[PDB]
């Protein structure tokens, strides 16, 4: 599949408004995601011993990952997927070391869609979510075409 530059500039309108406060964006999603999918949560020894919401939101190692995420992320979706570079070395970890399934990353999807959508009604109307789900279904697709290059079923 393949977006339309209208798509793309519906996707970098929203990510700009994130792009106010990445890390208060990074929190509000990986949070979310932990809470609607918590066996998520297994995947990472480093953040797997949180309880709470309230754990979580005090994290700073937490917040500083999210970060990391969220600035990864943008990267991709600035080359409108033009992101062969970048998505070589995140599948090859995620694959091999983090062991992240594809329905993992639907989960993930869900919760940014979550996230921009109660924050951002201004610029994630019915248009705009649309054009980030079709974004985020090209790089979960072309993840998968990584992860079995890779030898990982995901
Ligand atoms: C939008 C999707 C995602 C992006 C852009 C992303 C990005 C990143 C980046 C940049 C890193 C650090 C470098 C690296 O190890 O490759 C990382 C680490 C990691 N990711 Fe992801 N990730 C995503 C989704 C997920 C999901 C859904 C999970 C788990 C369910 C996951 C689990 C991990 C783990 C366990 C680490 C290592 C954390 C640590 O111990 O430092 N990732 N991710």
Do not use: C
């Not at 070391?97 to 951002?120: D, G, N, Q, T, W």
């Not at 079709?134 to 990982?152: H, P, S």
Request: glycine share 6%; hydrophobic share 40%; net charge positive.
């Amino acid at each position: 599949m393949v977006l339309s530059e209208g798509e793309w500039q519906l996707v970098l309108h929203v990510w700009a408004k994130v792009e106010a406060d990445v890390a208060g964006h990074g929190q509000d999603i990986l949070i979310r995601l932990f809470k609607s999918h918590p066996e998520t949560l297994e995947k990472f020894d480093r953040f797997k011993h949180l309880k709470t919401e309230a754990e979580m939101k005090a994290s700073e190692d937490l917040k500083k990952h999210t970060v990391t995420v969220l600035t990864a992320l943008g990267a991709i979706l600035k080359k409108k997927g033009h992101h062969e570079a970048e998505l070589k070395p995140l599948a090859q970890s995620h694959a091999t070391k983090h062991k992240i399934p594809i329905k993992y990353l639907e989960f993930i999807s869900e919760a940014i869609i979550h996230v921009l959508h109660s924050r951002h009604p201004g610029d994630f109307g019915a248009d705009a979510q649309g054009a980030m789900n079709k974004a985020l279904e090209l790089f979960r697709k072309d993840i998968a075409a990584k992860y079995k290059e890779l030898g990982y079923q995901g």
